[PDB]
Structures are given as C-alpha cells and as structure tokens.
C-alpha cells in the first residue's frame, strides 16, 4: 500500500512497542467474543462459551500470536503485501476455507486493541495509517481466492 513517510513512521514507531504475543491473544479473543460466528473455524480449540473462557483459552492465545507474527512480518514489506502473503492467501482459501470478510473484522478489532492498549498515543492520524495497513493486509490475504 501507499503510505506517506509520516504514516509509515507512525506505524513503525507504534509497532516497536507492541508485545506481539499479548496483543495477538487479545485481538483474536476479542474477535471470537464480539463476532461469535467466527468461532466457526476453531471448534478444535476448547471452551469458547463465555468471554472469560475465550480470553483465557491457551490455544486462542497461541494462535493469536501465530497470526500477529505473520502480520508483523508483513509490516516489514508494506510495499508488496500481495507477494508476502500469497502463500498464506492460498492456504486460507484452499485448505482452511475462511471467508475473507473475517480478515476485515480482525483488522478492525486489532485497531480497537491498539487503541485500548496505547490510549491517547493512538491519535486519529495514527489510526488512519493503521486502517490503511489492515485493509491492505486483508486485501493481500484475499487476493488468491477463487
């Protein structure tokens, strides 16, 4: 995607402070709580019946970390998100059968989690820059659906 250099250094600076394991676990857990039909893909994961059960489930936290890890690696290649995520795009279509609308919902939950975590440091221009990035990563992950 196309970020102005002051949007790129807003995204970069904020992300140096993110504990990927902790924010990942929170973003995937809040996805499964706020939009519970996304639990569809995870019934091998255990008890997902209350908010407290989802946020403390160890397989949600482990998977959350896996997901934000691969998202982190895409922040390093913001000039060609489609090439970075082509293999995972193909895997989420052909093998996991994940409706790409789920990537957009996680994108917006991750902006809520960053806002919750960083408070007044997550200013309206920094949010704007992270909304272009998570729309770009959603886009990249949907590209090889067929």
């Amino acid at each position: 995607v196309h970020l102005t250099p002051e949007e790129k250094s807003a995204v970069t600076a904020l992300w140096g402070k993110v504990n990927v394991d902790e924010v990942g676990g929170e973003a995937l857990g809040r996805l499964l709580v706020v939009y519970p039909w996304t639990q569809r893909f995870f019934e091998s994961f255990g008890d997902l019946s209350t908010p407290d059960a989802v946020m403390g489930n160890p397989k949600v936290k482990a998977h959350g970390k896996k997901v934000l890890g691969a998202f982190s690696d895409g922040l390093a290649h913001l000039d060609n998100l489609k090439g970075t995520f082509a293999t995972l795009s193909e895997l989420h279509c052909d093998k996991l059968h994940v409706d790409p609308e789920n990537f957009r919902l996680l994108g917006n939950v991750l902006v809520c989690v960053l806002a919750h975590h960083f408070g007044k440091e997550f200013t309206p221009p920094v949010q704007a820059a992270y909304q272009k990035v998570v729309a770009g990563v959603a886009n990249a992950l949907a590209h090889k659906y067929h």
């Binding site: 706020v34 939009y35 519970p36 039909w37 996304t38 639990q39 569809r40 279509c93 059968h97 994940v98 409706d99 790409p100 609308e101 789920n102 919902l105 949907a142 659906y145 067929h146």
Partner: protein
C-alpha cells in the same frame, strides 16, 4: 419495514415464480458462486459443478423458505425461527454474504420475469430480501 404495497408486490411476483421456485433457487446459487467466489468457502463439502444434485437440492430448500416467508410476510420472525437458529448457531455465515445471495436472487428474478419486474416491484423485492436477511441474521449475537 415492508409497506402493504410492498407485500402485494412480493406476493404477485412470487406468485408468477410459482413452480419454478426450486429451479430459480439453484440458478441464483450458481450465479453467486461464479460472481462472488468467496461464498464458496461455506460449501467445501458440495459438488459445485453446474447442475449438481446438491446445488439443485439446496436451491429448492432456499426457495421453499422464501415461499414460507412470502406466505407469512406479516410474521417472518416466527416463520423463519428455525432457520435463523440454524444460521446463527451452526452454519454461522458472515452476514455480508446474505446481500450477495439477495442480489443474485434479484438478478435471477429479473431474467425470468420480464413483464413483472417493474421499478416498483424491484424495489419491493430488494426490500423483502433485506428483511429476510435481517431475520436470518437476528440471533447471531
């Protein structure tokens, strides 16, 4: 909210659909899978090639539910109660895909009802399919 005039227009148009409801139901599913390939992620267990018995079967089931909703258009929450539990708790289709199947059902009705698909009936049918989508989406959270 469906106006009484919308209910008259939906009953007239779906009246003309009549016995082809099952066949139109399968055509709309096939138009959905070709136009919007991301909806195929909810049917990985189906043969989705043209004319398969699974799609024609499913087409007939979609169509009988819409016939049930037209017959009870004043009471669609109670009429589709079983179907809104099934999509909320078991299938869990993301709500964005109901707009994609409504558009392909509308396109299928257009292509088969040349005399009946007036502007006002198009409006009323779009509005009816959005109310069915809202009712099937009602109990998701």
């Amino acid at each position: 909210v469906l106006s009484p005039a919308d209910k008259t227009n939906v009953k007239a148009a779906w009246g003309k659909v009549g016995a082809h409801a099952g066949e139109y139901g399968a055509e709309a599913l096939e138009r959905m899978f070709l136009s919007f390939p991301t909806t195929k992620t909810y049917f990985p267990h189906f043969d989705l090639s043209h004319g398969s018995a699974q799609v024609k079967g499913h087409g007939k089931k979609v169509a009988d539910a819409l016939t049930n909703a037209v017959a009870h258009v004043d009471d669609m929450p109670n009429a589709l109660s079983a179907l809104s539990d099934l999509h909320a708790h078991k299938l869990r289709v993301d709500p964005v895909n109901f707009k994609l199947l409504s558009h392909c059902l509308l396109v299928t009705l257009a292509a088969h009802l040349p005399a009946e698909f007036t502007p006002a009936v198009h409006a009323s049918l779009d509005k009816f399919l959005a109310s069915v989508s809202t009712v099937l989406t009602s109990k998701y959270r």
